[PDB]
Point group: D2
Chain length 121, copies 4
């Protein structure tokens, strides 16, 4: 048995402009796994959502085809995670978004890359 | 502005034995994105959690180094998603888990691969 | 200093039909890295080429957007590697190919997934 | 039928120091796929080899567990490709290498991430 995993119970959108997005959020109990670390799925969801925001900031609509993520450092309760998303390639039919998460001490938590199919403007 | 994304508000563990895990869950409103599809992060979290369960079913403890996921078909409200995880490679220090999600009609929703570092027994 | 890495100096196409591909090849010296193992790029290239063959076998043309690979066991000189490719998802606009490599002892060497844009 | 795919028939190592690597190479005929573009496996092998070089430059030895690559723009015959590698995370047990390839016009060709187990 285990508890539900939730993401974006709180957040602040600091920047969302022209393929560049910055969002902060506070790690809470629903963010965690059984070992008291930020859940792998929670962290991925932070990245994915900010990828979607990048797509919107480009004035586009899109759907994710593929995503890859590297976990570097555990996130902990009360951490303020800064999620920065950037469109690193804007193609005709596809976009590639890089998203990285750093904690309040500037240490890299995780990084992810999203391969998006643009469905509209 | 957007709503929180949640995963495992409900579930049933059908099978969890020797590196093979099957878990069902019902897609609900907190599962969805703004377009009314199962959120990319939600689906990833379903897969990741079942990967962790595979690790446990092997009698091991581990941490995810890297994960990749392919989105094939949208999940929808009230879908019953069947999440099946399998350890496809059990190494000395690393494990590779394949996890796939199918809906109640047997259609493939998504598939993911997790590269785990075994930290204990 | 290091030597060039080559792939497909030899191969045998056992099957190439309707999204299902099997190709065999023998690991040679040009296949190897400094440690005498099959080079990661060599193994990846085997997989990618067979992905392209799956694409051809479906009567389609496509361009690879993204690829992921997991290395499981080292390949060695004189290994006979069996490369099997399958289209695990055939969409209207995208295809997903799974490719796996096993050696002559049936041991899993590596596996990869290719995300293709149908052109 | 298809020809062998080769990588590093030529190269110049511009920098290999403390986790930072730059290597250049000229795309040749053995680099190409049937469509006359740089082969996906060729590009990947360029990236992987430079990842291995980052590893060496850190004074470490390692084995690649997993790799991901995104293809952004086709490489062409006679392109001069600049391959840049960096260790973006150096852990005790694992390293993560980012590798990117740009052509002579400064256009991004591809980028890849390597997940290495330090041995």
């Amino acid at each position: 048995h285990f508890d539900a995993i939730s993401a974006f119970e709180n957040y602040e959108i600091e920047k969302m402009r022209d393929g560049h997005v910055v969002v902060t959020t506070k790690v809470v109990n629903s963010s965690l796994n059984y070992y008291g670390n930020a859940h792998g799925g929670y962290l991925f969801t932070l990245c994915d959502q900010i990828s979607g925001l990048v797509v919107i900031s480009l004035g586009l609509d899109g759907v994710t085809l593929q995503s890859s993520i590297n976990y570097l450092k555990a996130g902990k309760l009360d951490d303020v995670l800064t999620i920065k998303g950037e469109c690193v390639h804007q193609g005709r039919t596809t976009c590639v978004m890089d998203v990285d998460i750093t904690n309040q001490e500037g240490r890299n938590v995780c990084k992810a890359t999203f391969t998006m199919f643009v469905t509209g403007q």
